Amino acid sequence: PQITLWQRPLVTIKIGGQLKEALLDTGADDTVLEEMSLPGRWKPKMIGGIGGFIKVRQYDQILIEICGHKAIGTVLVGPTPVNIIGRNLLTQIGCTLNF
């Protein structure tokens, strides 16, 4: 589909059996979601944004579904103000910027 930017580009994602609202963020290297449980191993990571850095948990090879499009990749979990879908997953669903 084609999503305009008149409003924040929020979409529904399915992950870990839960449905959540997330922001398609072309300026985000990674994907980070608010506190939640995920299966498998994880390792700590520090990520920076405007405002400074926060500590998150990194889970690899996680299945996710964005607008019906399936993909797999690394998902970060931590004290983020909003759920963010980063480029690591946007590429997998074939998302591009056009103008």
Q: For residues 87 and 84, what is the distance between their CA atoms, to the nearest angstrom?
A: 10
Q: What residues numbered 51-90 form the site for its own copies, per CB under 8 A?
A: 51-54, 67, 69, 80-81, 84, 87, 90
27 binds its own copies (CB under 8 A): yes
Rule CB under 6 A: say whether 75 interacts with ligand HI1.
no
Q: Which residue reads 């580009």 in tokens?
A: 9
Q: In this structure, are residues 94 and 43 in contact, taking their beta carbons and an 8 Å threshold?
A: no
Q: Is 42 helix (H, G, I), strand (E, B) or coil?
A: coil
Query: Is there a catalytic annotation at residue 60?
Result: no
Under the binding rule (CB under 6 A), the answer on residue 49 touching ligand HI1 is yes
Does position 41 interact with its own copies (CB under 8 A)? The reply is no
Name the residue among 35, 72, 27 with its Cα closest to residue 55.
35
Q: Which stretch binds ligand HI1 (CB under 6 A): 9-17, 28-36, 64-72, 90-98?
A: 28-36
Tell the burial category of 61 from Cβ atoms under 10 Å away from its Cβ (0-12, 13-18, 19+).
exposed
Enumerate the active-site residues: 25
Contact set with ligand HI1 (CB under 6 A): 23, 25, 27-30, 32, 47-50, 81-82, 84, 86
